[PDB]
Amino acid sequence: PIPRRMIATTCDAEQYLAAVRDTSPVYYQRYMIDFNNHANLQQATINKAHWFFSLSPAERRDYSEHFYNGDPLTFAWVNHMKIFFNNKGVVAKGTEVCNGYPAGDMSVWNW
């Protein structure tokens, strides 16, 4: 469910997103289109992503289950974490380089 590299990454959400923006631009733009079509859920999505990136490798491994079983966000916008979790190619290229991007750069959420 959650790729092994996302379990392991020491990057934060904005470093990862900026890395995807650069290394898989089509996936980033499609995610942002989807994000901006769910405006009511944007902050929730951001808080979730922050929360996930605060967990340890082992804890994120533990989360894999609870993620699967869904939360409000998962039934309201299935693809809310799609950029983070769904394609192992995108995830590999993002997690390769994201440590070179600026932590906390919230403009990556703002398309």
Question: Using CB under 5 A as the criterion, which residues of the chain lie in contact with Cl ion when the complex forms?
Answer: 38, 40-41
Distance of closest approach, residue 50 Cβ to Cl ion, in angstroms: 19
Distance of closest approach, residue 14 Cβ to Cl ion, in angstroms: 22
Closer residue to Cl ion (CB): 38 or 61: 38
Tokens found for residue 79: 């693809």
Distance of CA 5 to the CA centre of its chain: 12
Integer Cα distance of 111 and 99 in angstroms: 21
Tell me which residue has its CB nearest to Cl ion: 40
Closer residue to Cl ion (CB): 76 or 103: 76
Integer Cα distance of 26 and 7 in angstroms: 23
Query: What is the residue type of 48?
Result: K
Closer residue to Cl ion (CB): 40 or 69: 40
Do 44 and 94 touch, CB atoms closer than 8 A? no
Distance of closest approach, residue 49 Cβ to Cl ion, in angstroms: 16
